[PDB]
Every structure is written in structure tokens, then in C-alpha cells.
Amino acid sequence: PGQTGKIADYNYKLPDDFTGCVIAWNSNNLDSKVGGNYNYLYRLFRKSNLKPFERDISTEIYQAGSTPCNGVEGFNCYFPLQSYGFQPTNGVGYQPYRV
């Protein structure tokens, strides 16, 4: 509550008046496999601002410049999602948290 971030804006918002509890634990030792973990991503770029408790299921192409992409990508039209590329045998610091 009260924090900011690209995750907190385009991935998952949380109310300031949130009275609750959250549980997390390490679970990346078998839910992943070598070759980069593209299974779990995080949203970076989105044209419409998200509201609290709204789901992000759209995968629209990022629209980088003022000149509209409008279905055609290229210069100033770049893809909005990228993978993690983490290695499976790293510590929890390089690992996701299951919440």
C-alpha cells in the first residue's frame, strides 16, 4: 500500500487501505527447467493505465512513438514482453516467489 513500480502499475495494483496478509515461499527448484524461464513474465509496457484490482490479459504490441503502429510494427514499434533468462541452479535471490 502506497508503493510504486512498473509491476505495481501494469502487473498488479494494491490499495493503500489494504488490511490483509500475504504468504510467499521458494518454489523455483522444480517448476523451472533449463533453457530460460519464459513461463513467468512481468508486464513492462502498456498504453492504458491500469486501475486497482484490474486484470492484465491483453498482449498488445507496444506503441513506442507518436506515429501510430496501427497494426504495422517497425521503427518505434517494439515488442512489449521479454523473458527472464535465469538459470535453474541459482539461489532464491535469482528465483521467483510463489504468493
Epitope: 512513438g65 507518436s66 506515429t67 501510430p68 496501427n70 504495422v72 521503427f75 518505434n76 517494439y78
Partner: antibody
């Protein structure tokens, strides 16, 4: 209030080096990017392009395409656009402009009205 | 689209009247989704690099001078200067940022009645 200011008198000799810089100010650099323009010293204005530095790939118009090695920096608050084989006829000022999520060339600086000999 | 470079040269414009900086767009207002237009105006006077004047062809920011008078839409664009004065006698240019390739046109170099 994003402000980018030019710098440096230009008397460019061909086959030489060039120092590319744009002092970005008024904003943390991870929010807004830089788009560049050349003025044809008294001809029609010439659009070239810019960069959104998230992956870095850019294509300009023909004259500014691939003469030199294209770089960018997302951290030290400098965008990069250069030329090789600079001649007198294209001896022009390196203009750069801040961007807005609505409009691309938003704010200029004082500018440099530079006349260049070879 | 085609990169705009006006020809033939002459299309008469007057100082102090409903001034017309004439450059047309090859596209209509048919913006496929949600109908947004992308129009600009950069006009070069002595030394000064032009700033933002017009965006999206209908709205300017608060503090933008009211010299711009809205007129024309679709495949045409024309801007009128309100009360052309000595500040308003300079070289004129127009620009749009809708599609590939992006370019700045030749503009209009002003001449006065005599």
C-alpha cells in the same frame, strides 16, 4: 519541465571524429526518450528519427542510416546519433528533442545556429 | 503515403488575411481503431527552432496562443494566423506524424503584397 540544451561549435573536417551529446534534464531518464533532427542549413527540414532505448534497434531516413556505428545509453542520460564521412554539403547541426507519450519532438533548447566549413 | 515535397512552387498566400499554409495529407481521418489523428506544426522564424504548436489537429495545450484557428479535416490541413504582425512574418512549414516515412516538408517561404 524537460530541458535538453545543445553544446559545441562545429567546424567539422571530413574523416575526423565527432562528439555526440544531449544534456537531458527535468526528468529521470527512464521515463522519456530522445528523437533527433537535422536542419539542412537553409533548405527543407529533414526528419531522421530517434530511439526508444529498450532494445535499441533503429532505422532512420536514407542519409542518416548506416554510415557510422549507432549507439545509445539508457543510464548516463545521453542518446546517440552520429555521422561518418561528414562533408560540407551535409554539414549540419545535430538537433535532438525530448519526447512525449503523445508527441515526439516536444521541447528544444536554445539551439546552436552553426555554419560549418570543411 | 508519399514523402511530401510541394510542386508546383506557387500557391498564393496573403499576409493578414485568413493565411493558408497549404499541405494536404494522402489519408483521410480513417484511423482504424478509436479514431485518433496525428498532426503537427513546426514553423521556423529567424534563428528560433520551432516548438510544439499543434497536436492531434484539434487540441492545443493551455498557454498555446490562440493565433491558430481550427479549420479543415480529412485529407486537407490548413492553419490560419490570427492578426499577422511583424512577429508573424517569417518562413512557414508544416508536418504530420501519422505514418512511414516521417518527413518534414519544404514549407512555404512568405512574400508580402507590393
Amino acid at each position: 519541465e524537460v530541458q535538453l540544451q545543445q553544446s559545441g561549435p562545429e567546424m567539422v573536417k571530413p574523416g575526423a571524429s565527432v562528439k555526440i551529446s544531449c544534456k537531458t534534464s527535468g526528468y529521470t531518464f527512464t521515463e522519456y526518450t530522445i528523437y533527433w533532427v537535422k536542419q539542412s542549413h537553409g533548405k527543407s527540414l529533414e526528419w531522421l528519427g530517434g530511439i526508444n532505448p529498450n532494445i535499441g534497434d533503429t532505422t532512420y531516413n536514407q542519409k542518416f542510416k548506416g554510415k557510422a556505428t549507432l549507439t545509445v545509453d539508457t543510464s548516463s542520460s545521453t542518446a546517440y546519433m552520429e555521422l561518418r564521412s561528414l562533408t560540407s554539403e551535409d554539414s549540419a547541426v545535430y538537433y535532438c528533442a525530448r519526447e512525449v507519450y503523445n508527441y515526439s519532438f516536444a521541447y528544444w533548447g536554445q539551439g546552436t545556429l552553426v555554419t560549418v566549413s570543411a | 503515403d508519399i514523402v511530401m515535397s510541394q510542386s508546383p512552387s506557387s500557391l498564393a498566400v496573403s499576409v493578414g488575411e485568413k493565411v493558408t499554409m497549404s499541405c494536404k495529407s494522402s489519408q483521410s481521418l480513417l484511423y482504424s481503431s478509436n479514431q485518433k489523428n496525428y498532426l503537427a506544426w513546426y514553423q521556423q522564424k529567424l534563428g528560433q527552432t520551432p516548438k510544439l504548436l499543434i497536436y492531434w489537429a484539434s487540441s492545443r495545450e493551455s498557454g498555446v496562443p490562440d493565433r491558430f484557428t481550427g479549420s479543415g479535416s480529412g485529407t486537407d490541413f490548413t492553419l490560419t494566423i490570427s492578426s499577422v504582425r511583424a512577429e508573424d512574418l517569417a518562413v512557414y512549414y508544416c508536418q504530420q506524424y501519422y505514418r512511414y516515412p516521417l518527413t518534414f516538408g519544404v514549407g512555404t517561404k512568405l512574400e508580402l503584397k507590393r
